[PDB]
């Protein structure tokens, strides 16, 4: 159990099983620490300066530069080992055909990119529902005779609405962040083995 | 004329007349420099560090700490002199009953706060129009007989729309920036003579 920071960050036995190791058997050691590295990072100029140093303390944490240059080596092995397992499905990861669990780079690829908002709005294969709290019939009051589509699926968003929603969302996103014209180039310029400062000045130009 | 940076920032003879001096007679000297101090500032951690130093060069700029501690004194006189003229209309400036010209603290107070977006949407005195490009009648196709309101003012936004617009705008603003509960306290805590670092740690608490 050691210094139980699992609870001090609010985690569980089915959460750390997915993150790293555990395997539905809470009580190898090197591996489990990874399941809290990106967690501080998800949950900048002055931050990352003291984010590493926060988990560096725990490295020390019965039952220095000792582990600062020994465990930190194991990081660079297992991230490039899985990144070579990620290069074997890179098309799935660009198309977004993947179940990325919240603050969790544990994955499982799927036939259609279900969890892409911009896919769901901009696709003509399947009906898109909303809450059962909205009557989206529009000509409801002029329907003296109801079909099965009326009865069970009065909650379906129509094309005119699906397009209005998508255009609100991107009008919004365009205000806060910046657009990436070269979708594939930007993705491939970062998914490579090259150093953080290498592509730093390269990506900026694209923008 | 000297080093004509008027044109290098794209200004004019009717723009500098309003900003400071000029008086529709382009060719006292101390005063006109003010009409370019806030202009670099409108058009942060690393910026203000080198914004002042940019106009400090021009102080030097025929026909040191010489003017760094002599003209910069004239700044603190004329800004607290007008700020005592602004305290005589502070209610107008909080209610937003004022014509603040773009990147220009030249003013002229007005009977109703016309240039407040959130006023225009949330007021029941005057009709609010939009472009002549939108037919906002809704029951237009069921109107075999047209009134004067129909004919000349088919472009009027109705309450249900004015409220939807206001709620989109604030749902948006709530995402980017933070809300100020104490509207009057926040305004008065900054409109005072006290030093920039004084209220710096005081305002943060309110948030």
């Amino acid at each position: 159990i050691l210094k139980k920071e699992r609870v001090s960050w609010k985690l569980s036995v089915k959460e750390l099983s997915t993150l790293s190791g555990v395997s539905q058997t809470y009580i190898t050691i090197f591996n489990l620490l990874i399941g809290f590295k990106t967690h501080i990072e998800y949950k900048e100029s002055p931050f990352y300066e003291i984010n590493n140093s926060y988990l560096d303390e725990i490295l020390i944490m019965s039952n220095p530069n000792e582990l600062i240059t020994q465990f930190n080596e194991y990081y660079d092995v297992t991230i490039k080992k899985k990144q070579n397992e990620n290069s074997k499905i890179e098309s799935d990861i660009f198309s977004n055909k993947i179940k990325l669990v919240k603050g969790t780079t544990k994955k499982e690829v799927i036939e259609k990119p279900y969890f892409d908002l911009n896919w769901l709005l901009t696709q003509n294969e399947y009906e898109v529902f909303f809450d059962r709290s909205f009557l989206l019939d529009n000509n409801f009051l002029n329907k003296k005779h109801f079909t099965e589509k009326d009865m069970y699926y009065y909650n379906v968003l129509n094309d005119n609405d699906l397009k209005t929603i998508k255009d609100l969302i991107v009008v919004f996103l365009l205000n806060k962040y910046n657009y990436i014209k070269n979708k594939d180039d930007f993705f491939n310029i970062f998914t490579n083995s090259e150093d953080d400062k290498t592509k730093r000045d390269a990506l900026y130009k694209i923008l | 004329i000297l080093k004509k940076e008027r044109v290098s920032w794209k200004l004019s003879v009717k723009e500098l007349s309003t900003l400071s001096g000029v008086s529709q007679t382009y060719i006292t000297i101390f005063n006109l420099l003010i009409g370019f101090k806030t202009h670099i500032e409108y058009k942060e951690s690393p910026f203000y560090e080198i914004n002042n130093s940019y106009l400090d060069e021009i102080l030097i700029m025929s026909n040191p700490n010489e003017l760094i501690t002599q003209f910069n004194e004239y700044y603190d006189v004329t800004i607290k002199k007008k700020q005592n003229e602004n305290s005589k209309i502070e209610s107008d400036i909080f209610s937003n009953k004022i014509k603040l010209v773009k990147g220009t603290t030249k003013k002229e107070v007005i009977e109703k706060p016309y240039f407040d977006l959130n006023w225009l949407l949330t007021q029941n005195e005057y009709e609010v129009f939009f472009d002549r490009s939108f037919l906002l009648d809704n029951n237009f196709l069921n109107k075999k007989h047209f009134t004067e309101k129909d004919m000349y003012y088919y472009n009027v936004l109705n309450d249900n729309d004015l409220k939807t617009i206001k709620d989109l705008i604030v749902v948006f603003l709530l995402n980017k920036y933070n809300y100020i509960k104490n509207k009057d306290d926040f305004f008065n805590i900054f409109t005072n003579s006290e030093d920039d670092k004084t209220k710096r740690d005081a305002l943060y608490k309110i948030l």
């Binding site: 001090s8 960050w9 926060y54 303390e57 | -």
Partner: peptide
């Protein structure tokens, strides 16, 4: 006075609520 550990062992042990 543990005014950060409840507002946001490790992190406590050493612009977070400005978001």
């Amino acid at each position: 006075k543990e005014f950060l550990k409840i507002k946001l062992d490790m992190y406590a042990q050493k612009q977070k609520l400005a978001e």
